[PDB]
Amino acid sequence: IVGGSTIQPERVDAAALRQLGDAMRKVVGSADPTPLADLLSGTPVDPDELTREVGADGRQALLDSGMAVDDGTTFSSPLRGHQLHGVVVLSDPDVEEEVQHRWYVDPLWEADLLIRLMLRRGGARALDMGCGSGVLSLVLADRYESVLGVDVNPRAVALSRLNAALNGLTNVTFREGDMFEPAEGRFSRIVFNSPTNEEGNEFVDLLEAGEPILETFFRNVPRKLESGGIVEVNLAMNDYPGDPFRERLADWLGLTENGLRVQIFTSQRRATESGGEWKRGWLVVAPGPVGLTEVEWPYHDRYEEDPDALL
Ligand SMILES: CN[C@@H]1[C@@H](O)[C@@H](O[C@@H]2[C@@H](O)[C@H](O[C@H]3O[C@H](CO)[C@@H](O)[C@H](O)[C@H]3N)[C@@H](N)C[C@H]2N)OC[C@]1(C)O
Ligand SMILES: Nc1ncnc2c1ncn2[C@@H]1O[C@H](CSCC[C@H](N)C(=O)O)[C@@H](O)[C@H]1O
Ligand SMILES: [Mg+2]
After folding, report:
1. Direct distance between the N- and C-terminal alpha carbons of the chain, in angstroms, rounded to an integer
2. Half-sphere exposure of residue 214: CA atoms within 13 angstroms, side-chain side
3. How far is the CA of 109 from the centre of ligand 1 (A)?
4. Cα–Cα distance, 285 to 291 (Å, whole number)
5. Residue whose CA is closest, atom 30 of ligand 1?
6. With a 6 A CB cut-off, is 260 part of the ligand 2 pocket?
7. Which residues form the Methyltransferase small domain (predicted)?
């Protein structure tokens, strides 16, 4: 029921979308919301006051793109607006798992934290695997010559395209497909906010896809990464007695065979039923001495006390 709305940025001229994006820049994320900020907060709004804020040509762009729905008396939006790290972003509202459509898009559960963890370097060509709303691609666009975002959710591809247009970003491309199959060539930068959490090995849905999605990602990383490239992954990791995640990870990447260096920064951990362990952390592949290192970095705790310990 949440996450199935039609999103059609192709039905709106890019100049009209850029203007809606500039209007969002003024009001989204600011106290004392205007009608447009009310609309993109999930509050029904009077179409006339909307029109006075975005014009008569913005109101129809809201409708043609799917950003807004005509209820007759009011306008309402299935999407919610954010402004962070120099971009405006629409995504689905944060709702419980039981009311999520199969094409529900990550409502930015961790995006703001992950952007602060990301290395601040730029480079030639970046890949956003599982791009969702497109948020990570939009931020990378400001320091990469081109960015490709990939998602198997076609609604996320459409939302990403819409968010790119709202921001007037022209060096970002999005493609529908399964993992690396639409990503041709090599990349200097690969980011993956992985759909893994509490499901262990089980595929539950596109947002909890099981460890096999990590195995496919890491097995194919070495042939997609430019030499000297950087990979950054948000992931949940399961250690089992006699079978720690890090050993499987070393096998998937071919650490020695491909000459790669990996660092795992573990932020949260808990004992599990098997006598093993669940962990959430941040994994970086970056040039340096071959092998694997794991360190404790409670960045969730630090984020909650002060978002400023970037890196
Ligand atoms: C893309 N990666 C992500 C990953 O970051 C990570 O996100 C979780 C996120 O699910 C958790 O939301 C959960 O609680 C919310 C509020 O109570 C509910 O409203 C959500 O419905 C519910 N799911 C969040 N509390 C803590 C995040 N760390 O697991 C999923 C992922 C899709 O795989
Ligand atoms: N086989 C697959 N290939 C490509 N993308 C996949 C996939 N399985 C799941 N995904 C996508 O992985 C994404 C994880 S959600 C992360 C969204 C975004 N990067 C953000 O940080 O908010 C989802 O959009 C999901 O549809
Ligand atoms: Mg789910």
Report:
1. 39
2. 26
3. 6
4. 10
5. 197
6. no
7. 112-230
